[PDB]
Design a protein around this ligand. Structure first.
Ligand SMILES: [Zn+2]
Lengths: 191, 59, 91, 84, 95
RNA sequence: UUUUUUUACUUAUUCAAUGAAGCGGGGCUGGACUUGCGUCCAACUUCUGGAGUUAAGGUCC
RNA sequence: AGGGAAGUCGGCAAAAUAGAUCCGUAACUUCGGGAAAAGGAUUGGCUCUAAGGGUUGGGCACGUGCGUGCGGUUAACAACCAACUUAGAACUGGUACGGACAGGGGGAAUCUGACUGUCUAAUUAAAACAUAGCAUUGCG
RNA sequence: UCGUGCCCCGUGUGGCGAAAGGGAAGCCGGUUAAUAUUCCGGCACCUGGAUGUGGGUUUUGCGCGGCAACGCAACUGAACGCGGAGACGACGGCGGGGGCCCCGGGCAGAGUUCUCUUUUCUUCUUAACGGUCUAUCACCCUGGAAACAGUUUGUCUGGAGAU
RNA sequence: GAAGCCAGAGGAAACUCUGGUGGAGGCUCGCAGCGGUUCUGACGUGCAAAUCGAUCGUCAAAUCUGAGCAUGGGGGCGAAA
């Protein structure tokens, strides 16, 4: 892992217009089931250009132009505030608050559905992958489409080695010893 | 570090982006640059025509 | 000459892991190891490099896709309703 | 021995520009020019001025580093500061 | 209908299939029509459109892929762009 | 003058982001409704895996 | 020697099997296996035979060792060079021919844990642990 | 020069941490009782600095040639940027090269020799650093392929231009 | 001897059969290594405060291993004894 998968910081260009980036690489992130996309944008304030790391939505490809901003079009890979999309649109990496660079709908094959808008208070009702309903500020951003790599869990792991390879880079506790197999001093289930 | 000991024409090709990009990519860069600036001129002409038509309609 | 009756690519696993589990894994292995037609250049050279990552050997395009297939039906249907919503918004 | 780095010896150590000399002495420009005229510090010309300063032009003035080091011990500096 | 017209041109008229022969036809200035497949790379598409604009040659954007354009031409290989030099007995030029 | 309820506020306190870069309010221009001129809403880049940096210029000295 | 588990709690230990070529191989099965299942025929030495390769090389007519215009696919022919396998046959010694060495005994079943893997260093390697698969709970 | 100022830029913060990771550069012969890619002899290389000579460039100021891939002893290049190298898993068979092993001849030496054995054995070597001519992939030019072709042990490649 | 691939024979096609090719597997016999099943084994004030012989398990990986570094006793670590 090199960089976290985050949106650009919410700046003037994304707040008032759109800024274009180019997708250079689609790479594998160890410990994550979804691919990442390296996207290069221009800096509006200096000559050097800025490289970002996004969670890649399905259908994204190398050499593709994507657009981030309020006035961006409704196309897969574009990053828009939730007030700029219609109801029924699914999005990925949805910010909980405008500016935290993405919190919701990030794993492979997952998305967040825009259920509705309350334009008077500037709120948006969304449906989460677990089925929960949430209300977020309408200026929260999201990337149009579904996170790539869907259907990963359908294939059986089939082997203790494949489970070990999965969890070694994930740091999760493996193998798992049952608490009932322990002594009474080791676990409350021990004995 | 062995590249610091050899002369410049051995480390490059006598072409734009020589020793950094290959000939096919340089040709693609030239054609893409020319076509995109021509399209920018065309789009600016079309925008000026539409602006003149809108100004004539408003006036 | 067909060498196995039913196991196919799952024949590398022998008698282990159970018949239903081998049959379940067989679909994913077949789809993840098949070659696909590139939507950009039209050649049958698109293959998986990592999970969700599909690259074309000819035109060198790399595409974010499904875990074991190039596209998922959910994403294809999503593209269809996205086109419908974009048409409604523009019109 | 350990490998030397480029630009750490030779004319780069031998010459200093007027800007570098003024910053080394922490003087103003009129005081520096006054002190150079009074102490006999003369402009010098390196064989290759890019070896001394990569932004140097044909109008860049160079001095001997040892001459500026000698100027560091002139008692007129404290007189300048006392008058200010 | 464009497939039927294309089949008529293959049967009666004269065509060249492929990028380099299409460019040679446009340079010669005897090309009557250019067909560009949908999945042709945008750089090559812009280059072909510029050549056809400078030679005053009509351009048809074929909605199929290069596989479909080759099948429409009646070949067993793909074709991203092609040039009609002689219409033959077809009315593909009248459009 | 004081006790409860809710009902606003910001200055204590708390959280987050940024290279603390474009916040708030006006002006100019265009579009809509309105009253017969007040709101709100918009300025700016979308065929292409190019390039974009040392201000060109105008006008007073 | 003869007998062949009569020994012993118990075939413990030992003996028997073993390489390779060929014939042949059951129930059961998650169809992948079981399987080297089982059960058989052979193996030395010598003198021969057969099969399996490589390299180089075409006639005319002009300009002059190269360029054309031809013409022909029996080079299916010559010259030179080279190695290790495989199959077949005769003859011959024999108490032995995988002559030392090296090298599965096999079969019918029952219980049991799915399997590969792991632990009580210095009395317990296992029906214990782990495992993939499955199910539940909590968290926006 | 209102002489005691003005301008530009943004990226943060230092150190330790590998005699198996990364990394500038040395080979051969000889030499001691005991050290040697360290000593001696011969023949080289790397890094940094200064400043000459020759050659090059220029009066069309910052080279020329090739359609091209690109070549050639040179052949300006600050700020600010882009890119490459450093820099990378495991396993499988296939092909090239060094060294080793094996076979034949020849000179020289040694052993065997009742008989046999034109016999059996030993030496027959060539460094770093350079020059020159070559070596799979790949790329360029012509041209336009179905009666599809090329092609690996392994079926990949081609009108996105194969043979 | 798994996918993939070639050829031949069928089949309207899907597919079916035959012969090759290929080289998969927490597959298997087995050398080193790693481990430690058995033996009225050797040894029993030993060569050894756990060693020796034969035999055995595993042997391309959940394999074996060095150095650097991290976790410290109300703790750690633990495929859990
Ligand atoms: Zn492609």
């Amino acid at each position: 892992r090199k960089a976290p998968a985050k949106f650009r910081p919410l700046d003037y260009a994304e707040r008032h217009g759109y800024i274009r980036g180019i997708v250079k690489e689609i790479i594998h992130d160890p410990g994550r089931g979804a691919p990442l996309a390296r996207v290069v944008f221009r800096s509006p304030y200096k000559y050097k250009q800025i490289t970002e790391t996004f969670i890649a939505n399905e259908g994204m490809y190398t050499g593709q132009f994507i657009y981030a901003g309020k006035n961006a079009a409704l196309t897969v890979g574009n990053i828009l505030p939730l007030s700029s999309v219609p109801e029924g649109t699914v999005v990925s990496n949805v910010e909980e608050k405008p500016g935290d660079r993405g919190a919701l709908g990030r794993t492979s094959g997952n998305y967040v559905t825009v259920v509705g808008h309350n334009p008077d208070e500037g709120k948006t009702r969304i449906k989460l992958p677990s089925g929960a309903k949430k209300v977020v500020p309408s200026s929260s951003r999201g990337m149009i489409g579904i996170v790539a790599g869907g259907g990963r869990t359908d294939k059986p792991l089939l082997k203790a080695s494949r489970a070990k390879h999965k969890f070694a880079v994930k740091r999760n506790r493996w193998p798992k010893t049952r608490g009932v197999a322990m002594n009474p001093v080791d676990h409350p289930h021990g004995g | 570090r062995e590249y610091a000991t050899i002369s410049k024409p051995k480390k490059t090709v006598q072409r734009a982006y020589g020793g950094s990009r290959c000939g096919n990519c340089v040709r693609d860069r030239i054609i893409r640059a020319f076509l995109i600036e021509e399209q920018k001129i065309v789009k600016k002409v079309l925008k000026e025509q539409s602006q003149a038509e809108k100004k004539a309609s408003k006036k | 000459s067909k060498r196995t009756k039913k196991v196919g690519i799952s024949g590398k696993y022998g008698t282990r892991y159970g018949a239903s589990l081998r049959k379940l894994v067989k679909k994913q292995e077949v789809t993840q190891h098949a070659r696909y037609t590139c939507t950009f250049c039209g050649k049958n050279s698109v293959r998986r490099t990592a999970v969700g990552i599909w690259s074309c050997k000819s035109c060198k395009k790399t595409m974010a896709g499904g875990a074991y297939t190039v596209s998922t039906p959910a994403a294809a249907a999503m593209r269809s309703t996205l086109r419908r919503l974009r048409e409604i918004t523009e019109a | 021995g350990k490998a030397k780095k480029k630009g750490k010896s030779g004319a780069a150590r031998n010459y200093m520009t007027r800007t570098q000399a003024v910053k080394k002495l922490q003087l103003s420009l009129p005081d520096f020019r006054k002190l150079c005229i009074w102490k006999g510090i003369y402009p010098r010309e390196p064989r290759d001025r890019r070896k001394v300063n990569k932004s140097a032009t044909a109008s860049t003035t160079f001095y001997y580093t040892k001459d500026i080091q000698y100027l560091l011990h002139e008692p007129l500096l404290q007189k300048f500061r006392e008058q200010k | 209908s464009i497939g039927a017209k294309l089949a008529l041109v293959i049967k009666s008229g004269k065509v060249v299939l492929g990028y380099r022969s299409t460019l040679k036809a446009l340079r010669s200035g005897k090309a009557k029509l250019i067909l560009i497949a949908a999945n042709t790379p945008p750089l090559r598409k812009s280059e072909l459109e510029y050549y056809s604009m400078m030679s005053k040659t009509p351009v048809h954007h074929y909605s199929g892929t290069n596989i479909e354009l080759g099948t429409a031409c009646g070949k067993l290989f793909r074709c991203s762009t092609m040039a009609i030099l002689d219409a033959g007995d077809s009315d593909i030029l009248a459009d």
